[PDB]
């Protein structure tokens, strides 16, 4: 509350560390469904159904331009990429499996770097 604070966690490396995680997600072999924005002119149903599209290149641009206020807003966008994928793709599809695999990969890196 006012003039009552928990001890200050060092957040000075968060930006660099989120960038490293994001590099590792970009270079994973199952990243291909997620590298670029879904083409809303060429994919029927996407625009109407997925209210907040997100992809790795869009996260990279937001990261690089100071549009994440803290490491939690960064994790929310990464998770959004996988939640969108699950909303639109069957579990038993290459893209559906890709999304489960990447979400796992991400969550481990996240816990190991920050928890």
Curated annotation (Swiss-Prot):
Residue span(s) of domain Bromo: 9-113
Superkingdom: Eukaryota
Localization (cell): Nucleus
Tissue spec. comment: Expressed at varying levels in several tissues, whereas a smaller transcript was expressed specifically in testis.
Bridged cysteine pairs (disulfide): none
Annotated family: Belongs to the WAL family.
Job description of the protein: Regulatory subunit of the ATP-dependent BRF-1 and BRF-5 ISWI chromatin remodeling complexes, which form ordered nucleosome arrays on chromatin and facilitate access to DNA during DNA-templated processes such as DNA replication, transcription, and repair. Both complexes regulate the spacing of nucleosomes along the chromatin and have the ability to slide mononucleosomes to the center of a DNA template. The BRF-1 ISWI chromatin remodeling complex has a lower ATP hydrolysis rate than the BRF-5 ISWI chromatin remodeling complex.
Subunit structure as annotated in this protein's UniProt entry: Component of the BRF-1 ISWI chromatin remodeling complex, at least composed of SMARCA1 and BAZ2B, which regulates the spacing of histone octamers on the DNA template to facilitate access to DNA. Within the BRF-1 ISWI chromatin remodeling complex interacts with SMARCA1; the interaction is direct. Component of the BRF-5 ISWI chromatin remodeling complex, at least composed of SMARCA5/SNF2H and BAZ2B, which regulates the spacing of histone octamers on the DNA template to facilitate access to DNA.
Protein name: Bromodomain adjacent to zinc finger domain protein 2B
Residues of the full protein shown: 2054 to 2166 of 2168
């Amino acid at each position: 509350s006012m003039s009552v604070k928990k001890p200050k966690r060092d957040d000075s490396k968060d930006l660099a560390l989120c960038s490293m995680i994001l590099t590792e997600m970009e270079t994973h072999e199952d990243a291909w469904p997620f590298l670029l924005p879904v083409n809303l002119k060429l994919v029927p149903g996407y625009k109407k159904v997925i209210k907040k599209p997100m992809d790795f290149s869009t996260i990279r641009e937001k990261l690089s331009s100071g549009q994440y206020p803290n490491l939690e807003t960064f994790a929310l966008d990464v998770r959004l990429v996988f939640d969108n994928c699950e909303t639109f793709n069957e579990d038993d599809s290459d893209i559906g499996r890709a999304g489960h695999n990447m979400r796992k990969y991400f969550e481990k890196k996240w816990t190991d770097t920050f928890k």
